[PDB]
Symmetry: D2
Subunit: 123 residues, 4 copies
């Protein structure tokens, strides 16, 4: 268990800030603030992580969601990040994400962006 390793404040290559608490039972709760896009201030996030990972050197699988509505803005979209926590001197969360926008059915083909974010504890 990486409850203590995951809990805290993380930053990605875009300058976004992810603040998370890891529960003993697998929960992830916190706030996300994007440095880019149709976003301002903090948004709620929730997710899950493997609270009993393999002990063979593998990372810890996890994921979370942000719906891009808060008191300031509504971007009618949601991002999910799916990835793994890798602990140690230079801890990281390595993720791939899917960002779906609400669309009409005629536009659904162009609804979903894909990308990759790497989070560190410094910067």
């Amino acid at each position: 268990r990486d409850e203590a390793g995951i809990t805290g404040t993380w930053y990605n290559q875009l300058g976004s800030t992810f603040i998370v608490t890891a529960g003993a039972d697998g929960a992830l709760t916190g706030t996300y603030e994007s440095a880019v896009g149709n976003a301002e201030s903090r948004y709620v996030l929730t997710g899950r992580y493997d609270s009993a990972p393999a002990t063979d050197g593998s990372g810890t699988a996890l994921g979370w969601t942000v719906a891009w509505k808060n008191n300031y803005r509504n971007a009618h979209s949601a991002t999910t990040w799916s990835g793994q926590y890798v602990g140690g001197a230079e801890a990281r969360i390595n993720t791939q994400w899917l960002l779906t926008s609400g669309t009409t059915e005629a536009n659904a083909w162009k609804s979903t962006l894909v990308g990759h974010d790497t989070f560190t504890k410094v910067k």
Copy 2:
């Protein structure tokens, strides 16, 4: 708001079952049971949805996570689904997902599966 449209039991093309409650504030909570893979019985899920969607005919953006640990099994992996709810006689949730396994750093290149699930209220 689609709190009432989303809340309930959904089934995908693989025969998996998704049971969700939508909160007024954007939360999604419930259980997932996969018909395939290294899985048995129910697993916790959490996620978020846009609680004030566009009124122009667009769908409602949402996402959720399952970490594949429960009292029965641990598949050292997490799936995130990112998609949209489309209401009406034949309501659907149309998703794309990312399934990340915990790996060593040598294996990280092969850590993540991608696919697509369509959920309906019947079958």
Copy 3:
């Protein structure tokens, strides 16, 4: 070998038309015409397929690319489809695709769409 099974005209769920020739050596060459997006008329495609698939009932892995420039339009983008051919009465090509647009480095995070197309020999 599925050289004869793959070669010919295919249609997807959007009404796009894919015309391909499969070479003995693994090549795929042809034209694509999209029913959606910043596209008109035919565009060049090239790709590769497994010319000696497994004989255990598995599908035949393949992929191809279209750059969205022709004599009519330039959408400064490219799509790659990665998938498998499944032969038999109701033959199909089942794909997932990635559509990357040229962007500035500030915009690179929003450069790439993801989706899924299923091609059949009728419709």
Copy 4:
């Protein structure tokens, strides 16, 4: 046009080697050698690029395919890379890829890996 900027030998973060020729007309032809996976020696690749990119500082969209069959091995799979070329002192190709394996229909849900490769002209 980036025919001269793209043509040549590129290396990714895994130590794989991509050797490509860019044609005046949008073609990409060459060989790929993976440092990882069920692969040995060189494999054929083909693809396409935007031969008349935007002049506003944007990158050049491109993609290519490798089917993992050569005279040595057959991994019954294909990878497609979709991305953009960014020119200048530290030129790069920034990609996302989809790796589909031939599967039975029961296994199709687990057929496709997703990841991201960054190619440079040194290392």
